Curated annotation (Swiss-Prot), chain A:
Modified residues (N6-acetyllysine): 52, 201, 225
Subunit structure: The 26S proteasome consists of a 20S proteasome core and two 19S regulatory subunits. The 20S proteasome core is a barrel-shaped complex made of 28 subunits that are arranged in four stacked rings. The two outer rings are each formed by seven alpha subunits, and the two inner rings are formed by seven beta subunits. The proteolytic activity is exerted by three beta-subunits PSMB5, PSMB6 and PSMB7. Interacts with AURKB. Interacts with CDKN1A. Interacts with MDM2 and RB1. Interacts with the C-terminus of TBXA2R isoform 2. Interacts with DNAJB2. (Microbial infection) Interacts with HIV-1 Tat protein.
Record GO terms (molecular function): ubiquitin protein ligase binding
Protein known as: Proteasome subunit alpha type-3
GO annotation, biological process: proteasome-mediated ubiquitin-dependent protein catabolic process
Pfam families associated with the record: Proteasome, Proteasome_A_N
Similarity remark: Belongs to the peptidase T1A family.
Cited SMART domains: Proteasome_A_N (SM00948)
Presence of the UniProt keyword Phosphoprotein in the record: yes
Induction / repression: Down-regulated by antioxidants BO-653 and probucol. Up-regulated by bacterial lipopolysaccharides (LPS) and TNF.
Stretches that traverse the bilayer: none
Curated annotation (Swiss-Prot), chain D:
Domain of life: Eukaryota
Family the UniProt entry places it in: Belongs to the AAA ATPase family.
Function: Component of the 26S proteasome, a multiprotein complex involved in the ATP-dependent degradation of ubiquitinated proteins. This complex plays a key role in the maintenance of protein homeostasis by removing misfolded or damaged proteins, which could impair cellular functions, and by removing proteins whose functions are no longer required. Therefore, the proteasome participates in numerous cellular processes, including cell cycle progression, apoptosis, or DNA damage repair.
Disorder this protein is connected to according to its UniProt record: Birk-Aharoni syndrome: An autosomal recessive disorder characterized by failure to thrive, severe developmental delay, intellectual disability, spastic tetraplegia with central hypotonia, chorea, hearing loss, micropenis and undescended testes, as well as mild elevation of liver enzymes.
Protein name: 26S proteasome regulatory subunit 4
Subcellular location: Cytoplasm; Nucleus; Membrane
Swiss-Prot record, chain G:
N-terminal signal peptide: none
Domain of life: Eukaryota
Compartmental location: Cytoplasm; Nucleus
Name of the molecule in the record: Proteasome subunit alpha type-1
Encoding gene, per UniProt annotation: PSMA1
SUPFAM superfamilies: N-terminal nucleophile aminohydrolases (Ntn hydrolases)
Glycosylation sites noted in the Swiss-Prot or TrEMBL record: 107
Family: Belongs to the peptidase T1A family.
Main localization, broad class: cytoplasm
Gene Ontology molecular function, alphabetical: lipopolysaccharide binding
Sites bearing Phosphoserine, chain numbering: 107, 174
Cross-link (Glycyl lysine isopeptide (Lys-Gly) (interchain with G-Cter in ubiquitin)): 112, 205
Keyword vocabulary terms for this entry: Acetylation, Cytoplasm, Glycoprotein, Immunity, Isopeptide bond, Nucleus, Phosphoprotein, Proteasome, Ubl conjugation
InterPro entries (UniProt xref): Ntn_hydrolases_N, Proteasome_alpha, Proteasome_alpha-type, Proteasome_alpha1, Proteasome_asu_N, Proteasome_sua/b
Swiss-Prot record, chain H:
The organism of origin for this protein: Homo sapiens
Keyword check for Cell inner membrane: no
Induction (record text): Down-regulated by antioxidants BO-653 and probucol. Down-regulated in response to enterovirus 71 (EV71) infection (at protein level).
A Pfam family assignment: Proteasome
BP terms from Gene Ontology: proteasome-mediated ubiquitin-dependent protein catabolic process; response to virus
Residues with the N6-acetyllysine modification: 68, 169
Descriptive protein name: Proteasome subunit alpha type-2
Predominant place of localization: cytoplasm
Length: 240, 239, 120, 85, 250, 240, 238, 232, 228
């Protein structure tokens, strides 16, 4: 006892338990994945509807930090909105100061040093949020970064965050990043977001998809989920 | 700086440090005091003096203005700052409204200060009770005591310190309106009340008066022995 | 086949107290003092002695909060204490209520008997 | 009933003391009052046992009579018993 | 964050300040200082804690600190905490000399210190000061003075004093050797070397182990006279002569 | 041993040893990394490796070879967040050396700066002691190349060939068996010892896509990370 | 239970307990029901007075010319986020000279109540807001929580035994869209009559009803303009 | 950072400062060192064993000058040593700016002792685990002072700190003496550092500095290897 | 387990506010009654000994001319809220040139009923009774340590609260007059006090639109008690 309470105390085996408890706090939240193609970044978040709870489009875990950068948060939600406001403000500082649009590398550093900066004191608690960062610029290419509650930021071609995490990142190695256009990769996400999280746990669900890349011309926005409706047209035909 | 609430509510409703820190009042020197209709008299007892050493530095009846006398119990160290802050307060009142300091005002100052000294962060509450006696402007004498709660409270006579129930029980047998029809009956009344107090060998009894226009007069051990003489001779007349 | 009847003090011990929803039923409570029932705890002395015609229940009943039954049974009894001591042939409510406000305060000075605290 | 025991007062110590020294014959200069009059916050056991110290030296000389010259001076031992002990 | 707090300020449920008692118990170790009833003079006594043959003796004062033209003090207990208190106290005295062009009287110098020690006892969550030091000096009004300090901040003026725990026996010896106004500094120094003889446990009172600082009022010098061992040794032989003479009664 | 809270914050034990720093000395061992630095005659070699447990993680982001200035490189062990948070303080204090003192900072002084800040993390009782281990190289005037190591206990420290991390208790025992002899140090001798000292440890003898080699050499004194092709040239150049 | 101490300490299960205990402070408040149409928004509360002689403590408080909030739980913190609510309304009313849409107001409540849920020695706010107003795109019914997670619903209810209100609302959510005010309100407080035991009224002296509309500024009715709404309801079944 | 600021160093029930005693135990776990004043200047000797043959002795120095006439060594832990090294470095220079005069070592140990004693009481720190030896040649008589984690300061003739300081203390009780020369202090200093060393002592093990009265000069491994050749 | 002074309960509620409510129970009693003509008010001074002077004790201080008050529990905590509430009324009058309504006073106090903490110590231990006559008529109010402020028509507090409320709903109706209510309070007081009711124990306080001011003098109370 006594080694798990505060964040600033090492445990005798040599790890920090508040950080380890922060890692598996995101483990209870629902699955949200991401993947990049050769010219764009595709997001997808499965969202939970039990009976009535909310109007369609409530508390969307897809955010929009800059003109060309977006979030895909999973875990506890309020601190994820706090990181959305802080990363928003950091893109405002870089945009105001140095005159050009923020690269995804500096944004990953300046956010990840804050997420780390709340794991050094017993003033605060470590965050309980993990989020994706997708972007595209013609002098940059599509990058996809992944920030955990511990503060580690690095780069995937594809990732997954949630309960069904390993099962939802098992199948991504079947897909090919290098050749595919992202317009395929939309339904190529929605097929396994429909496949993972089988409906015995929760009766119903609802899907969000957000898509930035070359076709949207740098601007990040949600795809019109009604428009082309490619998800469930493949997904009801993907059970057999 | 120093952000921590020292004094919090106990689940049975009490503050501890207020209603516990009166034990430091209970284990200090005693002090009594009555008010005459003309001359007041207060005095400290249980001095426990070394009886071969100096005595003016252990003097624990002092003044704020000449209008106002002090008397207190408990540990004197915390009482010193209350006295000096009370003096700095009662001088700027002279800088304002040109009458001298009314005693009820200065008792609201020590009481309000001691209240917010309990209320604030990271501050041990004071462990003193104190008396504030002074014949005010328009010649009217009155007295008040303090409290570590900070509740000023006007008595006719005093018992604070060790055995306050003893002397405070004793002065109900005092309060016949004959006492005090004379000022020598008031002073010998205080010392005869301090007979039931600690040893009362004529050494540890330090009394001081104020004759309603005069500065306060620390009496020498000259008429204390004569008041013990007429008190013991009066007890010789009591049988 | 005997059912059971169980009296205790504090909510712990928890295991039979969390086993009792697994088996037992009927969690009820003292009784305890009330604004009213004290008059019956003061009427347990009704047929006792001979009540002076001017002795009143409600007068004393309204003066005694959190009385339980214990002391306030002796409260009416400590009249007979000073009665025999002061030779009083029968007792007047003023006689003990002088020693009652004493005996409540004198015994509430040191001890409030915080029954609320015992199980909390 | 829970009985409150008050500590002895000045005349209670006077009322208590003579019951002991009633049997132990005091010398001429021995006085009950002045000693216990100056002493404060005693116990009935001590004020009973303060006579035993004179029951040593006077009995070491084998004397039926208490002497205050000792009873004063020997009281320092019981005074030392309460003071230092 | 608050469960690591040590609570140095709060009253403890029996009646007393819990921390100031353990403050006074540290003054009860490692210190021995006293002063004497003296006209036309006043003396201080000091006991060498480190009497090893390997120190330098180049400080020219080991337990006496000269903090004005007219005053001094005697450290007891944790020494460097008093090396905070003499910087603070010396600066208080010197700023009073700035504000008034007149030497500081000793009383308000004492209260001006004890409000700081008291200020750490009252509030802070802070380790209190652990020094109970003495005071000597001259003033315009009251001639010569002695004072006493506490970690609680309560001060008293003496005419013969007690530092530290070994000096309670020196208080019994001073009341058993009491007088009223006799100095005649050889009488006061013979009494002081007598008290340091019979109180300190090491026999014969070696000339290195003791230290005496005197203050004679001279117009307008007010000399703080710190005396060397060559006038300690013949004082020791004077007292040993008085012990050899006084033992002849039996 | 223990007395009080000495097993929790950085206060002394009754034997004369704080426990939080000697927990930090095995806060490195969660990383799983061997990193060896060798100082040659006119050159100095960093060797590291990486673990790529996914095919979706990148090869371009997980490189621990961080560049501080254009004459100073470094490599990191220990946990990731403390390691990267050390790096911006290294870069920032190097840049303030350039602004204040006008000439390029020696590699000696930067480890004194980082060691003193890590001391201030150790000294004060309510802040976590940053369990990463810092390793520097660089070039000085007339002093050849230099290697330094900064442990999270606050001492600047630097030797002929040093290695700390997970497996390095035996790696230092191999470097004692390899340094003290009559051999000089040429360039491919230092590189060919930097691999084989680590290949004696792990006993794998693996592909050149795993070890990252940063090097510095006084012909062109700029810090330089090798391309994979010339890494393969060294790695088959050692195979006789 | 030593990790039930403060807001800083995470659980070994991943659930920070101070938030759960503050949710318990949400459930202890009285019932209130907010539900919208496409053209209006109606929130109805139920007061619960202390004794007979004391007047019933009110819930619905006016905030802006279109923003109104219900409350359950603590009261002083409701005045705190009330004063912050007014001040952030008339800030942008002072600067931009337009009223604020609701959907960017509530992010100031989340970022306002966030920081007292993370740093040491700061409690969360026991709070029960049911926000209602117009932006240009119609009505909105939000709810808050002390964990600061705001939900865009079509109808919710918070307070004591408010789940019965929900299980009323789900079998009428297909019919709570087209209808206008006079049956929308009684469709509101039918959920309140299911939040009570079935042996006492449903009086006039306790229920308060607030509506916000397009040609109708936000208005609170109190027992007497309420008395025209409570007339003509169905009897509670046997 | 938070304003916690409470002193974790409190009093014992006996009245003993506990963290200062434990910090003195952490001094006793440190490397041995000895320093001798003798009649023209002061010689400080320290004992530095690299834990491996891999190490470099040219990088870290233990004898560290403070002015051009003041040296300073320790016996304790280096990371707590260098902080008050730098604090003394900045602290002497305000004296050189105000008074325009080379600062006396007596003033140094007063001020550094004030820093350290003032640091034992402040908000939530451990005390330093360092015991210093401070030397120098001011006004014609060379000085040697010792401080400690209690903030105290002593004036030793020839002392020793670290491991076996009762062994080197009794050795410096008799073998150290009235008066020597500068080279004669080096012999007995290397001997008393050769009391508790390993089986070999080279130019890389010891590292010895002196104070001439004309100025400081830290010695080189050339003469450090020449004097210990000549076992002591 | 001295925990974290601002921490919620398992029920939950603020621990220290819930502990603060129990501090009202050992304080002295009081009685307020709202009349259509005004507001009468009653308290007991609780004389501790014949040593003390009885008339220096304050349980009613009068905030403005037209807004009365009644304090309870710890008096020295109450004095701070009194003196600052007066400042808030005067600031209302000097920005606005009108009388501050009786309602907004208790918002202006209860907005700082909860300011305890470490940054930005303990909550107050008083239960106030505010009276007064604004333009809305004679209002009678009541605030707690929690700040939960509510109108009360006829409120009791303190130790006697249970029996005084419980006995008090029986004897109250909508059309009470003033001199009916004044002698309707002292019946309850002489039931609930332990000392004999006389000229030194209690004090009344009335405030009316047409009977003002109209404070609280002696020898009125002599006529008031002797009507029993």
């Amino acid at each position: 006892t006594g080694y798990d309470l505060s964040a600033s105390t090492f445990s005798p085996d040599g790890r920090v338990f508040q950080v380890e408890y922060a890692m598996k706090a995101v483990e209870n939240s629902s699955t949200a994945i991401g993947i990049r193609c050769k010219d764009g970044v595709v997001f997808g978040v499965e969202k939970l509807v039990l009976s009535k709870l909310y109007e369609e489009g409530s508390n969307k875990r897809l955010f929009n930090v800059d003109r060309h950068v977006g979030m895909a948060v999973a875990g506890l939600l309020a601190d994820a909105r706090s990181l959305a406001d802080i990363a928003r403000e950091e893109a405002s500082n870089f945009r105001s100061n140095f005159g050009y649009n923020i690269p995804l590398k500096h944004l990953a550093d300046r956010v990840a040093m804050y997420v780390h900066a709340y794991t050094l004191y017993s003033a605060v608690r470590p965050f309980g949020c993990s989020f994706m960062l997708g972007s595209y610029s013609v002098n940059d290419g599509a990058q996809l970064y992944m920030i955990d509650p511990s503060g580690v930021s690095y780069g995937y071609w594809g990732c997954a965050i949630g309960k069904a995490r390993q099962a939802a990142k098992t199948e991504i190695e079947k897909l090919q990043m290098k050749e595919m256009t992202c317009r395929d990769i939309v339904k190529e996400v929605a097929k396994i977001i429909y496949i993972v999280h089988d409906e015995v746990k929760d009766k119903a669900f609802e899907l969000e998809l957000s898509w930035v890349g070359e076709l949207t011309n740098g601007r990040h926005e949600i795809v019109p989920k009604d428009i082309r409706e490619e998800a469930e047209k493949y997904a009801k035909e993907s059970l057999k | 700086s120093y952000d921590r609430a020292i004094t919090v509510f106990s689940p049975d409703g009490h503050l501890f440090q207020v209603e516990y820190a009166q034990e430091a009042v209970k284990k200090g020197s005693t002090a009594v005091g009555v008010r005459g209709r003309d001359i007041v008299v207060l005095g400290v007892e249980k001095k426990s003096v070394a009886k071969l050493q100096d005595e003016r530095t252990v003097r624990k009846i002092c003044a704020l203005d000449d209008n106002v006398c002090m008397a207190f119990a408990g540990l004197t160290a915390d009482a010193r700052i209350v006295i000096n802050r009370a003096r700095v307060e009662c001088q700027s009142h002279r800088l304002t409204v040109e009458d001298p300091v009314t005693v009820e005002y200065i008792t609201r100052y020590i009481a309000s200060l001691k209240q917010r000294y309990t209320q604030s962060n990271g501050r041990r509450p004071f462990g003193i009770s104190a008396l504030i006696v002074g014949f005010d402007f328009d010649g009217t004498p009155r007295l008040y005591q303090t409290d570590p709660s900070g509740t000023y409270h006007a008595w006719k006579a005093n018992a604070i310190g060790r055995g306050a129930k003893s002397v405070r029980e004793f002065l109900e047998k005092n309060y016949t309106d004959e006492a005090i029809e004379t000022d020598d009956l008031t002073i010998k009344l205080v010392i005869k009340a301090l007979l039931e107090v600690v040893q009362s060998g004529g050494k540890n009894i330090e009394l001081a008066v104020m004759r309603r226009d005069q500065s306060l007069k620390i009496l020498n051990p000259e008429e204390i022995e004569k008041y013990v003489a007429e008190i013991e001779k009066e007890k010789e007349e009591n049988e | 086949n005997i059912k059971v009847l169980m009296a205790t003090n504090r909510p712990d011990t928890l295991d039979p107290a969390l086993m009792r929803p697994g088996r037992l039923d009927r969690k009820i409570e003292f009784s305890l003092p009330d604004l009213e029932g004290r008059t019956h705890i003061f009427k347990i002395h009704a047929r006792s002695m001979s009540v002076e015609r001017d002795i009143r229940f409600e007068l004393l009943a309204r003066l005694c909060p959190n009385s339980t039954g214990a002391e306030i049974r002796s409260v009416c009894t400590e009249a007979g204490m000073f009665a025999i001591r002061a030779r009083r042939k029968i007792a007047t409510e003023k006689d003990f209520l002088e020693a009652v406000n004493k005996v409540i305060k004198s015994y509430a000075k040191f001890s409030a008997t915080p029954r609320y605290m015992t199980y909390n | 009933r829970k009985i409150e025991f008050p500590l002895p007062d000045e005349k209670t110590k006077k009322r208590i003391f003579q019951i002991h020294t009633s049997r132990m014959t005091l010398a001429d200069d021995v006085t009950l009052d002045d000693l216990i009059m100056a002493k404060d916050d005693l116990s009935g056991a001590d004020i009973k046992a303060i006579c035993t110290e004179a029951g040593l030296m006077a009995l070491r000389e084998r004397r039926m009579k208490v002497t205050n010259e000792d009873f004063k001076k020997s009281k320092e031992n019981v005074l030392y018993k309460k003071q230092e002990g | 964050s608050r469960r690591y707090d040590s609570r140095t300020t709060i009253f403890s449920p029996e009646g007393r300040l819990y921390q100031v008692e353990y403050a006074m118990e540290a003054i009860g170790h490692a210190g021995t200082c006293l002063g004497i009833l003296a006209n036309d003079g006043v003396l201080l006594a000091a006991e060498r804690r480190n009497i090893h043959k390997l120190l330098d003796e180049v400080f020219f004062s080991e337990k006496i600190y000269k903090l004005n033209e007219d005053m001094a003090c005697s450290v007891a207990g944790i020494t460097s905490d008093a090396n905070v208190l003499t910087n603070e106290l010396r600066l208080i005295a010197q700023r009073y000399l700035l504000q008034y062009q007149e030497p500081i009287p000793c009383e308000q110098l004492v209260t001006a210190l004890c409000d700081i020690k008291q200020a750490y006892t009252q509030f802070g969550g802070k380790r209190p000061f652990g020094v109970s030091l003495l005071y000597i000096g001259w003033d315009k009004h009251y001639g010569f003075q002695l004072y006493q300090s506490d970690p609680s901040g309560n001060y008293g003026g003496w005419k013969a004093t007690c530092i530290g725990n070994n000096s309670a026996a020196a208080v019994s010896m001073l009341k058993q050797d009491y007088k009223e106004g006799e100095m005649t500094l050889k009488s006061a120094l013979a009494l002081a070397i007598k008290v340091l003889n019979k109180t300190m446990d090491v026999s014969k009172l070696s000339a290195e182990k003791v230290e005496i600082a005197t203050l004679t009022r001279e117009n307008g010098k007010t000399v703080i006279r710190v005396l060397k061992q060559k006038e300690v040794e013949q004082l020791i032989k004077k007292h040993e002569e008085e012990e050899a003479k006084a033992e002849r009664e039996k | 041993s223990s007395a009080g809270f000495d097993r929790h914050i950085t206060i002394f034990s009754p034997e004369g040893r704080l426990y939080q720093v000697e927990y930090a000395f095995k806060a490195i061992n969660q990383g799983g990394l061997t990193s060896v630095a060798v100082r040659g005659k006119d050159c100095a070699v960093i060797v590291t490796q990486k673990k790529v447990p996914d095919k979706l993680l990148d090869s371009s982001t997980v490189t621990h070879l961080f560049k501080i200035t254009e004459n100073i490189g470094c490599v990191m062990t220990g946990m990731t967040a403390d390691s990267r948070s050390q790096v911006q303080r290294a870069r920032y204090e190097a840049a303030n050396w350039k602004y204040k003192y006008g000439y390029e900072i020696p590699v000696d002084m930067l480890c004194k700066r980082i060691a003193d800040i890590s001391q201030v993390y150790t000294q004060n009782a309510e802040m976590r002691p940053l369990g990463c281990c810092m390793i520097l190289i660089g070039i000085d005037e007339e002093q050849g190349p230099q290697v330094y190591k900064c442990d999270p206990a606050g001492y600047y420290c630097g030797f002929k060939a040093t290695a700390a991390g997970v497996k390095q208790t035996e790696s230092t025992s191999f470097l004692e068996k390899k340094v003290k002899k009559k051999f000089d140090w040429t360039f491919e001798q230092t590189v060919e010892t930097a691999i084989t000292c680590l290949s004696t440890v792990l006993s794998i003898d693996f592909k050149p896509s795993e070890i990252e080699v940063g090097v510095v050499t006084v012909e062109n004194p700029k810090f330089r990370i090798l391309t994979e092709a010339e890494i393969d040239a060294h790695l088959v150049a050692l195979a006789e | 239970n030593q990790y039930d101490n403060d807001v800083t300490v995470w659980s070994p299960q991943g659930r920070i307990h101070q938030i759960e205990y503050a949710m318990e402070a949400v459930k202890q408040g009285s019932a209130t029901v907010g539900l919208k149409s496409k053209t209006h928004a109606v929130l109805v509360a139920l007061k619960r007075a202390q004794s007979e002689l004391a007047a019933h403590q009110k819930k619905i408080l006016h905030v802006d010319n279109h923003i109104g909030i219900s409350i359950a739980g603590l009261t002083a913190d409701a005045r705190l986020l009330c004063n912050f609510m007014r001040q952030e309304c008339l800030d942008s009313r002072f600067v931009f000279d337009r009223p604020l849409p609701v959907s960017r107001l509530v992010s100031l409540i989340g970022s306002k109540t966030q920081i007292p849920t993370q740093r040491y020695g700061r409690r969360p706010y026991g709070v029960g807001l049911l926000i209602a107003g117009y932006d240009d795109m119609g009505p909105h019914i939000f709810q808050t929580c002390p964990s600061a997670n705001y939900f865009d619903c079509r109808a919710m209810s918070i307070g004591a035994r408010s789940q019965s209100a929900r299980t009323y609302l789900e079998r009428h959510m297909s019919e709570f869209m087209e209808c206008n005010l006079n049956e929308l309100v009684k469709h509101g407080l039918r959920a309140l009559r299911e939040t009570l035991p079935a042996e006492q009224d449903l009086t006039t002296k306790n229920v308060s009803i607030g509506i916000v509309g397009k040609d109708l500024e936000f208005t609170i009715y109190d027992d007497d303009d309420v008395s025209p709404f409570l007339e003509g309801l169905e009897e509670r079944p046997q | 950072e938070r304003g916690y600021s409470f002193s974790l160093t409190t009093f014992s029930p006996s009245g003993k400062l506990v963290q200062i005693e434990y910090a003195l135990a952490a001094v006793a776990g440190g490397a041995p060192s000895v320093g001798i004043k003798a009649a023209n200047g002061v010689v400080l000797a320290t004992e530095k064993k690299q834990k491996s043959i891999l190490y470099d002795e040219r990088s870290v120095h233990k004898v560290e000058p403070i002015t051009k006439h003041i040296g300073l060594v320790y016996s304790g832990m280096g990371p707590d040593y260098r902080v008050l090294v730098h604090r003394a470095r900045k602290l002497a220079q305000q004296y050189y700016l105000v008074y325009q005069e080379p600062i006396p070592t007596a003033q140094l140990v007063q001020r550094v002792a004030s820093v350290m004693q003032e640091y034992t009481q402040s908000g939530g720190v451990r005390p330093f685990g360092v015991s210093l030896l401070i030397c120098g040649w001011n006004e014609g008589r060379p000085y040697l002072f010792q401080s400690d984690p209690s903030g105290a300061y002593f004036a030793w003739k020839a002392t020793a700190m670290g491991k076996n300081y009762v062994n080197g203390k009794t050795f410096l009780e008799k073998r150290y003496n009235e008066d020597l020369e500068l080279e004669d202090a080096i012999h007995t200093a290397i001997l008393t550092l050769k009391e508790s060393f390993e089986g070999q002592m080279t130019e890389d093990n010891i590292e010895v500095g002196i104070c001439n009265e004309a100025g400081f000069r830290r010695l080189t491994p050339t003469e450090v290897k020449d004097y210990l050749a000549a076992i002591a | 387990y001295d925990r974290g002074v601002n921490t919620f309960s398992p029920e939950g509620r603020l621990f220290q506010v819930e502990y603060a409510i129990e501090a009202i129970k050992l304080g002295s009693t009081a009685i307020g009654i709202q009349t259509s003509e005004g507001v009468c008010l009653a308290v007991e001074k609780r004389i501790t000994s014949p040593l003390m002077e009885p008339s220096s004790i304050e349980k009613i201080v009068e905030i403005d001319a037209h807004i009365g008050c009644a304090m309870s529990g710890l008096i020295a905590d109450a004095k701070t809220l009194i003196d600052k509430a007066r400042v808030e009324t005067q600031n209302h009058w000097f920005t606005y040139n009108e009388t501050m309504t009786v309602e907004s006073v208790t918002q202006a106090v209860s907005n700082l009923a909860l300011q305890f903490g470490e940054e930005d110590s303990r909550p107050f231990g008083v239960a106030l009774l505010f009276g007064g006559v604004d333009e809305k008529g004679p209002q009678l109010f009541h605030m707690d340590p929690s700040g939960t402020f509510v109108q009360c028509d006829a409120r009791a507090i303190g130790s006697a609260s249970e029996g005084a409320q419980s006995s008090l709903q029986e004897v109250y109706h909508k059309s009470m007059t003033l001199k009916e209510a004044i002698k309707s309070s002292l019946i309850i007081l002489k039931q609930v006090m332990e000392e004999k009711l006389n000229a030194t124990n209690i004090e009344l306080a009335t405030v009316q639109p047409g009977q003002n001011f109209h404070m609280f003098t002696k020898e009125e109370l002599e006529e008031v008690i002797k009507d029993i």
